[PDB]
RNA sequence: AGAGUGUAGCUUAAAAGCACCCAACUUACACUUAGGAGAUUCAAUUGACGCUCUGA
C-alpha cells in the first residue's frame, strides 16, 4: 500500500572512457565445419569475458567450390580488453581462416 | 627526481604453421570420422588413381624447417608452429645483460611514436608491424635516479628483414629460451604477458 | 593454440561424405578442406 | 550395430577429452588473467609516472576498422 | 465525437480486510487484474476474485512470486530478471480457526 | 633480511554451494538433458613448505 513501509515491494519493471562501436567479425572459410566451430569458440570466449554479442548470422554462399561465411557482432570494449581480445583471436585461429574487424554497413 | 625514460617492444611473430595434432586429437579425429560416416546420408577407380598420383607427384612443403638448422636463431624462420619474440643482446656501461630491445623516449614523443621508432631503430629494415592499442603489456623498474621500462606489444604482418647477418645478436625466442637468456626477475617474467599458448 | 577447435564437425543431419583434401590457392599453401571425392591436392590456375 | 568394448572406449575417449580441454581452458584463462592484470598495473604505473599520457593511452587507433590478417598454413611460400 | 465511457464502477476491491473472520466460500476481494494473489486456503474464480476456501482469519502478506513453469510470460520476465532479484506479490491467506473435527465417544461397546 | 600470510576460480561453507567444460537441441547463444575433473602445503593452537608486499 502507498502509505505502508512495504510500498513498492512488488515493483519489477525497473529491473528489466573511450569505447569501440559495433564490430563485425566476418569468418569466411573453406569449411562449414571450421567456420561454425570458430564461431562457437569466439562466442564462448565473448560470453566468458562478458562481451555484448548481438548476432551470429551468416552471409549467403557464393559460387565461383564454395566458402561458408559467418558473422559475429560485438559491442563494448576497453583499452586493454580489446587488445587481449584480438590478440587471442589472432593466436587462436585454427587453420586457414579469414577474420575481420569490419563494422556495420 | 631524475628519471631515466625508457620504453621497449616485445615483437610478436605469429605462427605461420599451425601446431601439429596430438595423438589424443588424432584419436578424436578417428572418432569424428567414423561417426560422420555413420550419420551421413548417401569408372571411379581410374579417377581415384589419377588423383592419388597427382597428389604423390607434388611434394608437400615441410611444415618444420627447424630440424635442419639447429643454429639459425637469427633467422626469422626459427620456428613455425609457435609464436616468436625478438630479443637482442645489449651492452651497457655498467651492465651487460641479454635485454629485450629497448629505446629512449622523450616527453615530446608519445609512447606509440616511441614504439614505431623502435620498430626499425635497431633492425634497420623494412619490417611491417601493427599495433593494437596504446595500452602497454609489461612494466619493470630497476634503479641504480629512478628508471622504468615499458614493454609494449606489436605483431608482424610482413617483414623484409634484409641483411639477416646483422652485427647484432637478435634471437627469436618462443617460450623456453626466455628464462635461459634473461636471468634477473625483472626480465624473466616477460612470459606472463607473452602469449605462451 | 591453433588446434582447439580444429577437431570439430558438422552438427547438421543431411549431408554426404566429406574428406580432408589439401588445397593451394595461388602460392603453395596447402590446407585441409572438407571436400568430396578426395583429390588430396588442389591448385587454382 | 556396435559392441560393448567400443562403447566403453568411446566413453573413455570422452572422459580424456573432457580432461584435456578442461586443462586447455584453465591455462587459457590463466594467461588471460595474468596478462590482463599486467596491463592494468602497467596502466596504473603510467598514470602515476605521467599524468598527461594516460589520457591519450585510452584512445583507440582508427586504422583497426579494416583489420586484416591471415591464419596459419602448412607449406609456407 | 466522444461516445461511450458511461460504464458504472465495478464496485470491485477488497471485501474482507485483515483480521476479519471469513467463512468458507466468502469472497475476500474482487479484482480486474491480479492485484492480490491467492494465498493459503484462498481460491481464485474465473474472474480473478479471491474467495475463502476455509473458515478463518484473513491475513495479507508479501511473498516471493514463483510462477508456474508453463506461464510463459512470467517465465520470460524471470529469465530477463537480473541475478539476485526476487519478485514479490501481495498474497491473501485464510488462517483456519476451527479444527477439522473432534473424536467423540459415540458408543461404549 | 622483514611483514601479510594459506580450501580446486570465489565463498565472516564446514570436505559443500556456486563457478567451469565437452556430447545432443539450437546459425549461434541461452535453456534443458546427459556426462567430467576437481582442493583444506608438511609436521606437532604452534613450527617449517608455497604466494604477495616492503629492500638490497
Ligand atoms: Mg469510466
Curated annotation (Swiss-Prot), chain A:
Cell compartment(s), UniProt: Mitochondrion
Superkingdom field: Eukaryota
Family: Belongs to the mitochondrion-specific ribosomal protein mL48 family.
Subunit structure of this chain's protein: Component of the mitochondrial large ribosomal subunit (mt-LSU). Mature mammalian 55S mitochondrial ribosomes consist of a small (28S) and a large (39S) subunit. The 28S small subunit contains a 12S ribosomal RNA (12S mt-rRNA) and 30 different proteins. The 39S large subunit contains a 16S rRNA (16S mt-rRNA), a copy of mitochondrial valine transfer RNA (mt-tRNA(Val)), which plays an integral structural role, and 52 different proteins. mL48 is located at the central protuberance. Interacts with OXA1L.
Protein name, per record: Large ribosomal subunit protein mL48
Residues of the full protein shown: 48 to 190 of 212
Swiss-Prot record, chain B:
Key word Endoplasmic reticulum present: no
Main location: mitochondrion
Keyword Phosphoprotein part of the UniProt annotation: no
Keywords assigned: Acetylation, Mitochondrion, Ribonucleoprotein, Ribosomal protein, Transit peptide
Stretch forming the signal peptide: none
Any one GO CC term of the record: mitochondrial large ribosomal subunit
Subcellular localization(s) per the UniProt record: Mitochondrion
Gene Ontology biological process terms in this record: mitochondrial translation
N6-acetyllysine: modified positions: 148
Record-level Gene Ontology MF annotations: structural constituent of ribosome
Family: Belongs to the mitochondrion-specific ribosomal protein mL46 family.
Subunit field text: Component of the mitochondrial large ribosomal subunit (mt-LSU). Mature mammalian 55S mitochondrial ribosomes consist of a small (28S) and a large (39S) subunit. The 28S small subunit contains a 12S ribosomal RNA (12S mt-rRNA) and 30 different proteins. The 39S large subunit contains a 16S rRNA (16S mt-rRNA), a copy of mitochondrial valine transfer RNA (mt-tRNA(Val)), which plays an integral structural role, and 52 different proteins. mL46 is located at the central protuberance.
Protein name: Large ribosomal subunit protein mL46
Organism of origin: Homo sapiens
Curated annotation (Swiss-Prot), chain C:
Compartments (UniProt record): Mitochondrion
Source taxon at top rank: Eukaryota
Keyword Mitochondrion: yes
Alphabetically ordered keywords of this record: Mitochondrion, Phosphoprotein, Ribonucleoprotein, Ribosomal protein, Transit peptide
Gene Ontology BP annotations: mitochondrial translation; translation
Chief location category: mitochondrion
GO CC term (a single one): mitochondrial inner membrane
Molecular functions (GO terms): structural constituent of ribosome
Oligomeric and partner information: Component of the mitochondrial large ribosomal subunit (mt-LSU). Mature mammalian 55S mitochondrial ribosomes consist of a small (28S) and a large (39S) subunit. The 28S small subunit contains a 12S ribosomal RNA (12S mt-rRNA) and 30 different proteins. The 39S large subunit contains a 16S rRNA (16S mt-rRNA), a copy of mitochondrial valine transfer RNA (mt-tRNA(Val)), which plays an integral structural role, and 52 different proteins.
Family, as annotated: Belongs to the mitochondrion-specific ribosomal protein mL55 family.
Protein name as catalogued: Large ribosomal subunit protein mL55
Organism: Homo sapiens (Human)
Included range, full protein: 34 to 78 of 128
From Swiss-Prot, chain D:
Highest taxon of source: Eukaryota
UniProt note on tissues of expression: Ubiquitous.
GO molecular function, one term: RNA binding
Keyword line: Mitochondrion, Ribonucleoprotein, Ribosomal protein, Transit peptide
Keyword Mitochondrion: yes
Subcellular localization, as worded in the UniProt entry: Mitochondrion
Record's GO cellular component terms: mitochondrial inner membrane; mitochondrial large ribosomal subunit; mitochondrial ribosome; mitochondrion; nucleolus; nucleus
Coiled-coil portions: none
Main location: mitochondrion
Biological process according to GO: anatomical structure morphogenesis; mitochondrial translation
Assembly, per entry: Component of the mitochondrial large ribosomal subunit (mt-LSU). Mature mammalian 55S mitochondrial ribosomes consist of a small (28S) and a large (39S) subunit. The 28S small subunit contains a 12S ribosomal RNA (12S mt-rRNA) and 30 different proteins. The 39S large subunit contains a 16S rRNA (16S mt-rRNA), a copy of mitochondrial valine transfer RNA (mt-tRNA(Val)), which plays an integral structural role, and 52 different proteins. mL40 binds to the major groove of the anticodon stem of mt-tRNA(Val) in the central protuberance.
Stated family: Belongs to the mitochondrion-specific ribosomal protein mL40 family.
The protein, known as: Large ribosomal subunit protein mL40
Originating organism: Homo sapiens (Human)
